[model samples]
Target: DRRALRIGVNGLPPSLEPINGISNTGPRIINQIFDALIRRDYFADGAKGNNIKLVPALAESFERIDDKSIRFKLRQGVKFHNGAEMTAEDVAFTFSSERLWGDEAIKTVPNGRNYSPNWDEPVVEDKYTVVLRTKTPSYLIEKYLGSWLGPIVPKEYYKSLGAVAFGNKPIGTGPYKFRELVANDHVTLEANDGYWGDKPTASTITYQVVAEPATRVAGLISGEYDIITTLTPDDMALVDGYSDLETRGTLIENLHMFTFNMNQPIFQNKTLRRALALAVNRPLIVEALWKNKASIPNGFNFPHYGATYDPKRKPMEFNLKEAKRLVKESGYDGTPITYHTMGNYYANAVPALMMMIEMWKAAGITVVPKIFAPGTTPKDSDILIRNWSNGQWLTDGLTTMVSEFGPGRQVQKRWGWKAPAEFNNLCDQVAQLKDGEERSAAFNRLRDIFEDEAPAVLMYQPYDVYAARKDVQWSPVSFETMEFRGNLNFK
Candidate 1:
């Protein structure tokens, strides 16, 4: 047994399966065990920095015959962790079993939709070439393939064990192989000796789930861990002085917002929603709570990643008089608003929520703060503070916008929130547009509508901070997807 490189992870990975991964932890774990047909060039810095440049992983090259059809040529001599050569059969099996298996089994957004019916229909194809045929003229297939949706895995390995078992002990052909998993403590992995690309420096890597930010910092300072992730502002303050620590910060593709439960009598009116948005002081919240570390989001989406981000779009300005007037017009003379929040979701959520409470109260709206466990059902709150991830820059903002504003949605369904028909229509159009200038235009239009309507109170875009040892030379991927095999190398 080789001594593993110790890493203090913030939390347990949500799921090992790529499709079932709902959080950052899950993607980090899956990236270690699986190889997508393509990988994003997220480490590229400067003017061309953070662009989604596709690099070959399992597939050597991909080409589109028609607007709707795509063909991927599997990289020759690549083998799975089970010692089976990569083939078209593996690609077909992965898409058929994981993607088309329905919402209950599939993990990606727009979950139940049949994304690759043409690819799966004509029996299982050979191992060398896997073709994908879509219902519409979709140009985003190659980009989508680079996402968590298109990793090819061995069919036999998944079939032998049930879905639950396979999820627990996943096998892949990446730079690292699954070694051992100790529940609630850590997951251990060793470098894949049979890896197809350049070998990793660390013989082994152990991901320890240390949830507390302070403990994560302590472990790194004590030299118990080589890499530590999700450092809070306080942790950042402490780690700045350590000569042995190297810290890097980047704007994460996550947005924190306050969603109004429209089903609630108090918030159903458009005036009330606008009033709530206007009443909250965003600058004060960012300054006092976040230490002005994040950029004030122009709308629901961040502008840095170029997903229809409109910097000129008007955010809900702090106007107490206007808020009071709107509240009065909405017929809510002085109804107390209940705000619900989760502690672990954001670094400054607690203080931000409290500031919101104070601000709204100052505007003459009685406010109540309710703190719940992250991801728990909100039973008795008018406003819900939730964070949306894996959207904007990475998925073109369509996935994020559609999931939140589309018809029969998760956010809306749970909270009974409703957007204007125009807003909803713009979202629908954005989703249908093929990847191009037109699609990008639609995204911007949708964002503009979101800012104008103020369906949700937009918050600052937080940074995903990681603290690592100064000696370990590694580049953090912009999207935060762990790809240990790629440009990442330790000196």
Candidate 2:
């Protein structure tokens, strides 16, 4: 088949093991080669968005017996590339609580802990039937498990291959089978002729690791590659000129922000934080570097959470006069604020930060920026710029308000800051409850505090850009997931 699609991405995934695939590219690539017991019903209930109905994949059906308990019936005759049949025992072992002996627990699960505690225990009732029982009353187990958790691995093969051997060549029940992996170079896949569902259109796919965006776009235009990701604006323009290529942009749930260290003297003065934010207008920032394709979220949570989700609140208003007043209120003599950042965190990272610094300069704020890699002294500087995106499956994890900002207390470890008591308490309360009006109200309140206190500058959701040869038809989701074999329609 001439349909051997060559794709150019930043880099190849480190591991193919589903549980060990914690990195962003890990899940994206793994998604193409694995199937979960329960998977996202992409077209279920006619919801166009990702993760709407986390239906079933390997399992025929999953039924919630009660709040704390659920039952699953495995699909019959579903076999791995090695011709091994998938079973409920594999599902049980994958979600096993015995994290001490082997394999990681599916941390993606809503198995709450300590303050808002709940535990999910998997039991293999029979060869094809499994049961998931939570320690306490827990909802959302069905939808939660169906998420980035992916699918069940062959429990027997896992132990046989072990970690080292498995990373070399892994097996899964998915559309494509692993053919080869050349680290920092390329990954190859051959279609699984025995795939349970309809076979993939292409017989083979190769992901070429092209770190440079310009090179990647050139490869697509030159017919060296069929599809590519990480397309810069200029690269997009180059592709737009040719009749043989096309570029598409979609809003992903990646929240790139300049986090604060509250313990720092400058941040202790909220005036400085708000001043820096007010001066740097995000709309202009988006227009400058973002290609004006991203959405500027006013609140911490995304807008589509629910109808009562308080979509009226706007982001921190940009006011040069207000910013100047706040800077003066801080009573700080004009001194350069130390900012720690990385050059290659994101594609437009450097340009975005430079524009922000320019915006603040217009408000008479001097930002002394230095590139310091995170994890050495993590908090050497007062401000750190980084990005965090949610998973690709079933609504891509829960609303982050309660997790990152709440009890998870990412600020303490990631940045030297202890959150306000009110925000932490609200998260714990809402963590115990399901999605509802009350939870939404508390989230809105948390947003009010986030905007008022200016814990950090929530810049904007990113737009993932990809360029491809005119021979293919494909579009990326809000999550930067890559299940190319299923969706890419080669013309």
TM-score of every model versus the real structure: 0.89, 0.88
**Candidate 1 residue lDDT tens string, 126-155:** 558877665655556666677767666677
- How far residue 286's Cα lies from its native spot in candidate 1, in Å, is 1.7
| Clash totals in order | 4, 3
- Candidate 2 lDDT over residue span 1-491, tens digit each: 64887888887666777656545566667876888776654434544334355557787887888867789898998898888888887778766664211224334322222112244667888999999766766565665576565456777887787654675698889888899998888779888888988778788888789878888877887788887887656566778889877887667656777766776777765678888878878898788786788888866766434432465776657889999888888885877876666655665666777787888888888876676674555544545333334332335224455556655556655555556789777766665556677766777778877777776777887777788777787756556666553467878
* Local lDDT at 167 for model 2: 58
| Highest-TM-score candidate | 1
TM-score of 2: 0.88
Which candidate number has the best lDDT? 2
Q: In order, what is each prediction's RMSD in angstroms? A: 3.3, 3.7
Model 1 ranges with Cα > 4 A deviation: 1-3, 45-49, 97-125, 303-307, 310-316, 373-376, 380-393, 412-414
